[PDB]
Amino acid sequence: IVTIHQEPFVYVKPTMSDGTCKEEFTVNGDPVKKVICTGPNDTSPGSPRHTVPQCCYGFCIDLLIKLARTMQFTYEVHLVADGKFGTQERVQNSNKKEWNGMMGELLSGQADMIVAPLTINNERAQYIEFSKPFKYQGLTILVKKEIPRS
């Protein structure tokens, strides 16, 4: 399975010196469940081309654990190298057209499932199957508060 970094969904914190994630309790009083990833280095695969085990947890990870418990399968989650959601590069320069990023990794046979905030539209649903929505949403704009000091 391949996942991508996202502010509210998936967190990526460095593991402890021992090799296990630092168990931290939540506010409700339940132990937070975390999974260990195998993600790329700090910046990119460009200069520091090397993978490192990290810690992953969040909403998508909890849903993944729930599914793995309810239908009894196993998984080995790992991040995406390109760090892009996915786009079909069809430049006529190389006479070939192919997907990049998460969809490029999925279609190439690297992974079997994508548990991440992947949207639904025509071009992406043309090639792969999309399950029922797990959260509804939309598109909006974000600005900085003026804080009127008149």
């Binding site: 502010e7 909890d62 992947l118 704009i141």
Partner: protein, 193 residues
């Protein structure tokens, strides 16, 4: 009459509201906005031919990740960032210096991707349909999406703080240092008369 007039009813009407707002229709160099490259918003943003020129502006600058974009808009660099509703809402909740403004458009939820043919693709759908009306999704949303750090912008009547109170307090306290001088000069004049 004048001091109350500048102490009430002084604020911008509203931020950008519509997607077809003339500012985005004719994009200038003063008003800057961008999104994340290689993503669905740009694909749907380049399919609207009626705003093709705007896409040119969108083609000017595209960030690598959403975190870099938020860090840029954080430090007074970018003016408006178009993204998903849930992520921007959670960012405005946690990071309390930014505000989401506008009406939603191009509404499409998040679905689990999978291969062209697979039995897992057949029963994960039924599994999510069963787990969504059983209180699991609402509980997960209340646990991981519902923090509510700041308060709200409920109404227009805003209370006062210790902003001008310090000024009027200094103005009051200033009087005694001149009063003692005037008293000394009064004793001096009484001595001479």
């Amino acid at each position: 009459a004048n001091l109350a007039a500048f102490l009430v009813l002084d604020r911008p009407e509203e931020r950008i509201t519509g997607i077809n707002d003339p500012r985005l229709r004719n994009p200038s160099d003063k008003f800057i906005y961008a999104t994340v490259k290689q993503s669905s918003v740009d694909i749907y943003f380049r399919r609207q031919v009626e705003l093709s020129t705007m896409y040119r502006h969108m083609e000017k600058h595209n960030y690598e990740s959403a975190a870099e974009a938020i860090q840029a808009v954080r430090d007074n660099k970018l003016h408006a960032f178009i993204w998903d509703s849930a992520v921007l809402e959670f960012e405005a909740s946690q990071k309390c210096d930014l505000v989401t403004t506008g009406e939603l458009f191009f509404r499409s939820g998040f679905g689990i991707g999978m291969r062209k043919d697979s039995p897992w693709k057949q029963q994960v759908s039924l599994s999510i349909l069963k787990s969504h009306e059983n209180g699991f999704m609402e509980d997960l949303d209340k646990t991981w999406v519902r923090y509510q750090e700041c308060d709200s912008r409920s109404n227009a009547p805003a209370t006062l703080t210790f902003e001008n109170m310090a000024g009027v307090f200094m103005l009051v306290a200033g009087g005694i240092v001149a009063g003692i001088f005037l008293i000394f000069i009064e004793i001096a004049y009484k001595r001479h008369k």
